[PDB]
Structure formats: structure tokens, C-alpha cells
Symmetry: D2
Subunit: 315 residues, 4 copies
């Protein structure tokens, strides 16, 4: 009679130890309170720092997620993950998961052996959220610090705080307070069941690099991407994707070689607006790191700029 | 009879023209002169005797350190004069993260140095420029602005060069510091100071570019999943003196990054691990290469690192700098 | 071919003169509205929103409902002051019953100020209202290039242009470079799905807001009691926490049939249920929005459990 | 060798228990101290139990007691600083009281915790550690009264509970934090540009009862009678939690004026949660500057022990 939730562990600080790494079965054991929310099965997809998360491991994760959500005896899925790269992995699965069932990413800033470690509660909130049927159809979820954020908006905004994960402009989809879920907001983009993206039959994703925008920014960074035959480049623009004349050169250069370039921003938030005056596609409100994921996945369907641009406004 | 303020222009949307007023995105930055700017706010004659000066007429995307030196040498030139009470600097927003901070390190006077910008062209409806400029001259003329570090004014806020930054691509209230706030606000034609910068700045800064003609080259390299090593090889192949890593979370290096950083350190390039995050502390970790950016943005870390390398190549001296400025 | 939009004028700083105004002056001032829609102006009232009252709200609410029921009205823009934009839009959010966009707009600076925000806000509001894609999103609050939900957004700073924020909830959408980007949707009961109708209401119940604080006087409840208020909202310390003096005074009111909601003086967040304390609980609703919900709920029911649920659903 | 730090306990959720860890009985100061053995690496601790209450119930009387005692401790050469355990519900006020009230350079760090000590991932232990770390840094000196939760060091003058229930609640969007605590080092970033502690004129050393000040909220249809009830019960000051920038409706206008008739001092603050309420000649009452309703009661309250002069009280609000 209780929901059947699978915890796929991938590593991260939620799984570390010290005197201030640890497998899935322990994370579960450190919170016996999980018993009261779901029947839990644990599975170890990887044990790496999320900084070392790569498109390849994401292909395995995504495939295993869809494989499990296809099952009649799996109600939702909770994914244990680091925070340094939690910007990208949930957005990946938001684009790539074929189910309506809850996929929920959980993480912690303090390791399990820290004074007032956030992992235990984050995990509890994440399983509770996953075990809720009202949690379906919401897109991939990101749960830490009592907040349920959308994979499309939520990112790490502070380097070291427990409350890092924010989306200033779009808030949190909802909230977990006093052992109650409080949904307030619904993502208004294409995701999960409605997404045209399918990585089920993909062995390898196209390479996509990220170039920063800044005063005196080198044109030779683009030459690198161009040389190594990268498929896409995400410019992390000054302000609203603004390019200097080196950005301009580098980008236009890349574009003649058939490299799809998307101008995002280095600011943290907001719309990069369309502009005939500048080269490259526009990222809408997509962060540089999430733009990479969308571009990377977009480059498995098409190379067409207007089409991909279309994705960038809808996804 | 009243304070003598000088406005030094560098271009930017504050001085952008556009064909129509409904249009907010995609125009000509630095199309108009400091005199056109000043003329549109005749209210400034209530605050200051104003002299305008055109240092540059570029969009701040194209702001180069070469113009920064020139600008920094000029501010110091003026504030040393008896007839100059404070400077206002009109500037783009795209790169207003870095120019204020630069002069925060290189200005040598108590006097107010207030950068000012607009998110909307002068032609836009409800253009923020005039009010912003009014506030900028206000702050500058007020003796009580003295010794507060270099200041950034937009949207009735007075932020510190050290903390403030463009936090949104396109909104008027872009310039924020979640963790540090604003030194002061401007409300009902009054200045309210609330905060002071608890870092080293201006008069007490050890960095002096009065006689420097070429600042050392510093590249920023982003952190992300599947980040390539070859970007580090690129900076090395080009004789760069410092690299700022815009790291994942608190400057976390991937395998590729660790190796890339480490190649750079071999050939004597100083590496600072900053954060793509947007705020907060990158703490020392002796299990990771390069030094640590404290709470300085990749943009700002690039500036300090650059100016640091004019003084020393000592990794420990520079690490001290990040913790102090 | 171009959408029909009625701008309903209520007053506010968006319509103020200085030495450093009717709906038609406002319209005249943004000639670019003509590119967005065909515009009719109406002056519902001309007050500072600080002087906005339930009975003017009713007049407005019915008029809005009346306008939106026409074939030839596509949407409604309400010009209004900021000091009470917390309340007015939420009111309409529950009482309106078309999917047609109802867009409140305001300005922190008067039209005469350097870099006055009125014109641009008014432009945005109309653009939003004239967009087919705006339908059925609940009542909206446009200022400073954001589309806020009436359920969430509130004045968070006394005097800045960007005052209107909902930290926990962000914006519904945004207006950048002359285009609208919708991003999130109100996951609460609103407009067409709301049970709250005021068509047949002449006077709304009286509801007071009492502030929570160290040494808070119990007599404030005694006062609200003397004047036979129907409901009290408590702007509690923290998550709606009562002192002994608040505990007893609320319990006092509750025994006289007055319905008490416990909200927060904090600015955001959930006041969770608690059997150890009296009053109902305000979910994430502010004190000012709690008033609007409670006073409307009092037109329907006096039943604590039903009222309580409204606060979790609406 | 190590700094001597006194912990003064007043109660609060930091000292709060519950039946299960997934969700109240009181816990002593020494229970809080033994829960964190790592404190001994930071300082010598003395525990002192001043009160044991929810901060809902914190009164101006106990704050007087809390003040006199903190001044008495800090006056000693062998006391380097004091950490105060206090509920979150009324940390808006107590800290600011002490900020005007303490005569010492020496750190006064308030600490609290949003989740009970009993709760899974409870925030009490780490918060206090932080609070003691700050109180035992000699660099915490001369910064005014300090508030530590969620790794942040906030100024008493600015910081407030902005969310009902979350861990990161205590913010000040316009002013930020004075410092933060990250990876077991303190990082100072900002200084309070206001009169505080040693420069304050507010002396309650010989004050037994504080004047009464009510807070009356501003809203649509706001009743004039709140003001009358304030008046009837001999209140010496009223703080107005106004609409926008302390804006008064016809009723608050009449009501304030009435209270001004009786020599009740009124301050127009704001219900919004941040920002400047400007002077407006065409409106009654004094003006709060950027002070919240809660902190305004506190500043008004103390000003009325010193003076009843409208001009002088207004100066306090632009200075403190
Ligand atoms: N390096 C860690 C950081 C964290 O989880 O907080 C990670 O795996 O992402
Ligand atoms: N592209 C412009 C943006 C602005 O100033 O608002 C610049 O940086 O010059
Ligand atoms: N007093 C004005 C303030 C404003 O609109 O900004 C009002 O009507 O609310
Ligand atoms: N009721 C508690 C709330 C808390 O501390 O979290 C108090 O203020 O004492």
C-alpha cells in the first residue's frame, strides 16, 4: 500500500565523509524515517564528484530512469547527486525522460558527517516529494533546503550556502514545510512526456563547449572549439549575450564551419533577447550550463538554426 | 559656490540612440555625447557645476584594459586637482562588473568615483538614464560619499565596486549583491548610507598603474560537465600570465580542469579558482590546484589577478590579495 | 483586427502631478498603445490606493465582470496605486470569472518624475492584456517589466521601482525587448474556477489585521470585538506564533463567532497548522491577502474547516 | 590561551524538543553545549540560563534584564564576548534592543534555530558553533550586535525573519550580511554604517519599566479605533506599519493625529519589509527611515526614556 521509490545514487557531497564515498544503502540507513513514506530500493549508478559528471554517465542515468519508470512497480525515482553540476543533470533528464512519474534530484552542501548536515532532511523531502502522486506532470524536480525547484530554472547561485539553489525570477515550484508538500507554481515549458528529445538510441552526444564573455576576451578560444571539431558552442555572454568584436569574429568563424552557436549570459538570470545585429542563436532565459544541455540534445535531431532557436524558446 | 563634479564618458546604453521608443533590445551604444547626456537632465545644475569629458564612445562589451588604464590615470589626474570634487563615469552595463572594481584598486583619492549606467537607451520610454545620472551626480557631490570606495549607481541604489554586478541580462534592477547589499540607497531626493566596504580600497590600495602601459594577459575559463582540457592549452600557447577558472560550485575542478590548471602552473601562469555560481566563498582546499577567489566573481577575480601580476608572481602574496581586496 | 482593451482608472501615483490625472491624460501620454490595441478609458475612481476600500473594490469587481462578459472586450487594464496593490489584484483574482486578462498596473514614480515608470509599465500592461497567450493565468500585476501573479506578488520595498517581488514564487512572466516570456503558472484556484462571486453582494464583512510583536496588547482584540468585526487576520511573529496575550485575545474573539486566521508578519513562507494554537492558518498568504480571502470567504461560509481549506486551495 | 565566552539562554526552538525527529519540551543551556563538543576547540564556555520561553512571549522587561546582565558580563576583563540563545519569532527585536543598549566593544552574537534540536538535519548545533566562532574572534569587535544562523552573520540593525519557516529566513535584501562563515573561517565583508553599542546614548542601566509602544497595521478599510484603544490605555508611543512608504488612509491619518493630540509619539514605518519611508510634510507622524515596524517599536521605546522631543526622536531614526 505505500509507494515504491527507487533511489539511484550518483555520488556528490550528500555521499561524502570526513572529520569536518558513502554508498546508497547507508544514505537510506541514516534516515529510517523513509520507511513511512515509501518502499525503498537503492541503486548505485556511479560514485563520483558531480564536477566529474559527463554526458556519457548522463546517458546511462537517463536510460535507466526511463527503464524504471516504464515499470508498473516503480512509482517515482529519486536521484542522489552532487551540487556543482546539479544545474545540468536535472535539465538533461527534464528533456529526456519519457514518463510523467516524479524524477527528483536530491543533494547536500554539507557532507553526511558534518554538524547540522543537510543530506538527511534533503533526502527525506526528496523521497516524500517523489512518493506524492500530485508530484506528477511537473517536470524534473530539484529538492534541497525545503524547496522543490524546476530543472528548467533552478541552479546553484551561491558557492557554499545551504540555500544555494534559487531561481530569483521563477521561484520554486513548491515547498516542503512541517512534513507537508505545498505546490504553488507550475513550469510553463515543454518537458518530459511532451519533449521531442529521445536519447534512448544514442551512444554518444555531440561535444559542446562554453566560452566566457569578458573584457579583453580572446578570439583564440573559439579557434580551439573549431579545431577540436566541437559541434556546438555556448557563449556565456557579457550582460545579454553581448559579444565584443573578438566574440563576434570567433562566433562568425565557428558558424561558417557549421557550428551552432547560442548566446546565453554570464549574469545568472534573465532573457537574452533576439538581435539581428549580433551573430548566433539566442538562449532565451537559459543559463550557459543548461543551454549546453539543450544544444547538446538539440544536435541529435537537427543542425537547423531556426528550428533549434525554436527549441530554445519552448524548452 | 557649490560642488564641482566632472563627468567622464565611455559610451554604453546610457548614451545609446534608437529609431523608436517602444524598443528596448538591439540599438546603438555610445551614439551620443556627454553633453547630450548632461543637457537632458537640466536638474543637475541644482546639485553641481558640471564639466563633461568624452574618454571613449564604445559599448562596454568592447571595454579593454587599455582604455581602463587611460581612464584610471585620468580620474587620478582630476581628483588630485583642487577644482574637482568627484567624478561620475557613464558606462555600459555589460562589463560594469569589472571597470568599477578596476578603479576601486587604482584610484588614489578619498573623493567619490561613481560609475553610472542605464539598461534602457535614452530614446526608450521610461529611460532609466536621466534618473540614474541625477543620482550619480548627487552621490558624487555629497561630501559624505567620501572614502567609501568606488561606487556604482542605478535604480536608486549605490553599490560597491567590490560586490555589485549585473545579475540579470535585461532588467532595470540588475545590479545587486545578494550577500553584501548596497552601501546606500537614494530615496526622495536624499542619500541614505547604510553599509561600508570592509575590504581594502583606493587610498589604501597597493596597486598603482600611473606608469603602467600594458597590463598582463588574463583569460577566464569556464567550468562545466565535459569541460575540455584544450582551453588551458590555448591560454598557454598564447603567453597568458594568469587564468581565472569560472569553476563549478565553489571552484571545483574536474579531472580535465585539474590537469589543465596544473599545466598552466608548470609554465608559471597564476591560476585562481572562482565560481560560475554568482556569489559566495570559494574556500581554500589543498587537494585542489590554483589559488582561491574568496567571494570575487570570475570577472572581478580577473581584474585583481591582472593588477596583482604587475606587482608579484608569488602565489602566496596573490592569495593574500584576494582575501584583502 | 486589433484587440479591444478597456483601461479602468482607479487613481494612484501612475496618475500623479508634482513640481519636480485622469485616465485619458495617461492614455494620451503613451501613443504607442495604439500599436497594441483599440483602447477605451474609464474613470472608476481617482484616489490614492492607500484609501482603497472594499466598497470601491466591489464597484470595480462587478464592473470588470460586466466588461469581460462582452463580445467586444478582450481584456482589462486597471491603473492603481502601489500602496495597496497587495490587496486589489488578489480581490479580483477570486471574484473575476472570465479567462480574459485582467492586468493591474502601477508606477512608483509620478508621471512628472525623471525617468517616470508609468508610461513603460502602462505599455507593458496593455501588451500583456492584448496577448491571447495571457488568458486564464489569473489576474496579473505588471510593473518593472515583470508579470506578477495576484496570489503571490506584493510590495516588498517601500520606495523602489522593483518593489514587486515574490521571492518564493518568482514571476509568471517577463517583458523584454518588446516581447512576452511566460515562464510559470499559478498552481492555485483562480478566476473562472473560483467559487467567490460578488455579483450579489452590497457590503463586504469587516476584517481586521492585528500585528504580532513583543508585548503585544490583548486590548487590540477587545477593540475589534467591540465593533463586531466578522474576521480577524493575525500578522503573527514568525510562522503565525501567538503570545499569551495574543493566544487569549484570539480565543476571546473565536468564542464570539469571529473567524481568526493566523498569518505572518515576516513577508513570505508557510504558516503551518498547529493544534496547540487557536485561529486558522494562512498557508503562504500574507496578512493583507489573508484579509481579502477571509472577508470574501465570509460571504460564503462561517465554517472553520471550509474556510481553512480555501486558504490552502486559493 | 582560549577566549572566555558566556552563553546566555532565553529559550527558543534552538532549545526545543519534540516526540519524533520528523517534526515542545524545553532544553537547558548545558544540553545545548554538550550537544556540540567541538565548541571547546573555540572557547571556554560558561552557560547561563536567563529565561526559558518562546520568543513570542519575550517582553521588554526580560530584555531589560538581558541587557543589564550582558553589560555586567562584558565589563569584566575575563569575558571576551557573549552568545545569546533566543527564539527566531522575535529576533527581529531583541538584537536591535541590545544594539542600542550594550556599552561594550566586545561581540554580542545572537543565535537561534528554525528546526527543533530534535529534528532531522536540525540547524541548532551548527548555528551555535558559528555563533561561538564569531563571538570568540577578536575581529568580531566593534561591529554592533550580531545575528548568526545558516552560516550568515547579520547586523542586528538590518536583519529580520523574512520567511515563516525556512532555514535561510534571516536576510536583509537591501543591506546584505556583515559577514559569512564558510569552511570554518569567518569572512567579514560589510560594516554597519549606523550608531551602535559604544556610541549609543541609550542607557537603560537604571531603568525598571520601559514605555509602552503599540504597533498598528495599515491596510484597506483600516479602523480608526485601533488608535483609540492605543490612546485609552496610556501608550507612550505608536508605530504605524503603513501601506507602501508609511502611507496613511483617512482613518490612520485621523487616528495618528488624535494620538499626537495626547503627546503620543507616532512613527510611520512600512509593512513591506524593506526600504526608506521618506519624510512627507503633508502627512502626520515621524518617519522610520529604513527601520521595520518591530525595530521601530524598539527605537521609539528607548527614545521615550530619554526625550519626548519630536525633532530629536526623528534624528535617532536617521542615525541608529
Ligand atoms: N563537489 C561536490 C559538491 C557538493 O555536492 O556540494 C559535488 O559532488 O557536487
Ligand atoms: N551593450 C550595452 C549595455 C548597457 O550599457 O546597458 C553596453 O554595455 O554598453
Ligand atoms: N500613494 C500612492 C503610492 C503609489 O501609487 O506608488 C498610492 O496611491 O498607492
Ligand atoms: N516559537 C519559536 C520559533 C523558533 O525559534 O524557531 C521561538 O521563537 O521561540
Amino acid at each position: 500500500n505505500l509507494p515504491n521509490i527507487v533511489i539511484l545514487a550518483t555520488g556528490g557531497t550528500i555521499a561524502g565523509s570526513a572529520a569536518a564515498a558513502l554508498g546508497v544503502e547507508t544514505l537510506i540507513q541514516a534516515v529510517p524515517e523513509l520507511k513511512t513514506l515509501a518502499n525503498i530500493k537503492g541503486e548505485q549508478v556511479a560514485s563520483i564528484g558531480s564536477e566529474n559528471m559527463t554526458s556519457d554517465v548522463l546517458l546511462t542515468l537517463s536510460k535507466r530512469v526511463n527503464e524504471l519508470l516504464a515499470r508498473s512497480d516503480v512509482d517515482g525515482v529519486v536521484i542522489t547527486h552532487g551540487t556543482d553540476t546539479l544545474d545540468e543533470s536535472p535539465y538533461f533528464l527534464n528533456l529526456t525522460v519519457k514518463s510523467d512519474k516524479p524524477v527528483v534530484f536530491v543533494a547536500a552542501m554539507r557532507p553526511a558527517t558534518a554538524i547540522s548536515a543537510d543530506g538527511p532532511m534533503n533526502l527525506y523531502g526528496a523521497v516524500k516529494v517523489a512518493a506524492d502522486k500530485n508530484s506528477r506532470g511537473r517536470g524534473v524536480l530539484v529538492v534541497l533546503n525545503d524547496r522543490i525547484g524546476s530543472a528548467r530554472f533552478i541552479s546553484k547561485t551561491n558557492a557554499s550556502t545551504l540555500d544555494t539553489f534559487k531561481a530569483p525570477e521563477e521561484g520554486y515550484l513548491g515547498v516542503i514545510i512541517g512534513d507537508k508538500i505545498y505546490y504553488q507554481t507550475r513550469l510553463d515549458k515543454v518537458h518530459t512526456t511532451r519533449s521531442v528529445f529521445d536519447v534512448t538510441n544514442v551512444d554518444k552526444l555531440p561535444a559542446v563547449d562554453i566560452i566566457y564573455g569578458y573584457q579583453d576576451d580572446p578570439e583564440y578560444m573559439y579557434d580551439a572549439s573549431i579545431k577540436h571539431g566541437v559541434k556546438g558552442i555556448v557563449y556565456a555572454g557579457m550582460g545579454a549575450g553581448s559579444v565584443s568584436k573578438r566574440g563576434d569574429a570567433g562566433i562568425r568563424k565557428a558558424e561558417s564551419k557549421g557550428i551552432v552557436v547560442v548566446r546565453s549570459s554570464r549574469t545568472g538570470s534573465g532573457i537574452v533577447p533576439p538581435d539581428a545585429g549580433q551573430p548566433g542563436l539566442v538562449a532565451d532565459s537559459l543559463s550557459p550550463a543548461k543551454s549546453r544541455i539543450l544544444l547538446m540534445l538539440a544536435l541529435t535531431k537537427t543542425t537547423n538554426p531556426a528550428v533549434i532557436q525554436d527549441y530554445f524558446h519552448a524548452y
